[PDB]
């Protein structure tokens, strides 16, 4: 989140005004809460699961401009997290198909599975 908020809210862009909503099932520790207090007007957090469509309804995913899926690039099993992030794309496209999803894949064949999704 720190590296994301550095590259996203950088002053070298124009006067951006999008808000950043986060969605994670694990509750944040005290350092993440201090980071969200450092960005009190630009960043909101909401604890939930992206697979559960009630939590997608909570973050207003139907009116969001885009949805971003960060990956754990140092995971122990790359096919496992590629499977999990593919499941996240399936869930968001199951709720709202007309959204723009940006994601990260760790192999190329798991990227090839994403084009088979009907949305």
């Amino acid at each position: 989140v720190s590296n994301f908020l550095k590259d996203f809210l950088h002053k070298d862009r124009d006067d951006v005004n999008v808000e950043i909503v986060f969605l994670h099932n694990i509750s944040p520790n005290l350092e993440l809460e201090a980071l969200f207090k450092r960005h009190f007007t630009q960043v909101e957090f909401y604890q939930g699961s992206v697979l559960n469509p009630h939590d997608l309804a909570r973050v207003k995913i139907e009116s969001a401009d885009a949805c971003l899926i960060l990956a754990n690039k140092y995971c122990a099993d790359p096919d496992a997290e590629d499977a999990s992030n593919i499941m996240r794309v399936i869930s968001i496209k199951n709720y709202h198909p007309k959204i723009r999803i940006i994601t990260q894949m760790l192999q190329y064949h798991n990227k090839a599975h994403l084009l088979n999704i009907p949305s």
């Binding site: 697979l51 469509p53 999990s84 399936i90 869930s91 199951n94 599975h113 088979n116 999704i117």
Partner: protein, 362 residues
Amino acid sequence: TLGFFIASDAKEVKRAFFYCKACSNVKKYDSTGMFHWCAPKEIEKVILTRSEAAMTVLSGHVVVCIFGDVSSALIGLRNLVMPLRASNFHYHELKHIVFVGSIEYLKREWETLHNFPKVSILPGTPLSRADLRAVNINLCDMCVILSANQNNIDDTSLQDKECILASLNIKSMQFDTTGVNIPIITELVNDTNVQFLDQDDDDDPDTELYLTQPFACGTAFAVSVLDSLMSATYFNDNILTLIRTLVTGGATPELEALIAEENALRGGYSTPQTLANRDRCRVAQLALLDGPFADLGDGGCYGDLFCKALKTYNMLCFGIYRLRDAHLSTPSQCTKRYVITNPPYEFELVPTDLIFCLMQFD
């Protein structure tokens, strides 16, 4: 005699006995005459490569996609193949079966399937779109997606990952039509994954499995719906035997004795009582647009069809495979059909409609 009925209640079927109005040497079948049977083949005789499967035209066939491995538990595919080889079908009326999956898992299982006529094997992957184009997946009568890895994965998030990905992969292919109309049945483990199988339905995690759309249209089937069979078997012990005749193609306990002894379906020589075994009925569907009762679909009554088909052809009728948008105002292109079981006598009959029925073997 005992009458097996279908009604909404138990005091309704109390009126089933409260009525007076007063007061030639070849082995074409098994040793019992219940299934078809052929010579025990070698596994190379049924393995096709992708070019060989591309050459053989397969229409009206069944494609069984399998996500197997060396380490996964055995599914027991004989219980899938055996109801599709029952002797109340003619040999031309059988459906070809092609298994698309890893050849290692099929090697572990083929010694039970190797006495059936029209079985093929393509050693590939269900997610590979090339192999599904080779087996002509647009022309199949059913595509069945199973997984043997339904018990050894400990993630509880992506147990049904492969089956959902394969379902959406077939749902997004295109031919020279789109692959959203291919009839797919996928088996699930966690019933909460049933929301990912369809796009246009309104998903909800608190709806039960029986009320969801892709279950009601008969495209999903989890084993959790068979939990009611324990109480069903206790209250009437003949129900489970009625099911196993209806479902496994008439598995009488003579074959249970045979598999207790030899654990192998053995062929037999044709006797006239063996041919008397073939008089089981067959469940089938009926198109309401060209047949002998095609005129009745002008908003008629379903019970008129019931009495007419039972008088003429001696064929029962469970219910209606009604289109999902056949009751809507605007004409859509959704070819998804849901299931109505035992409609009343005065039920209206849309012309574009399918009828669940039990057909005799003449």
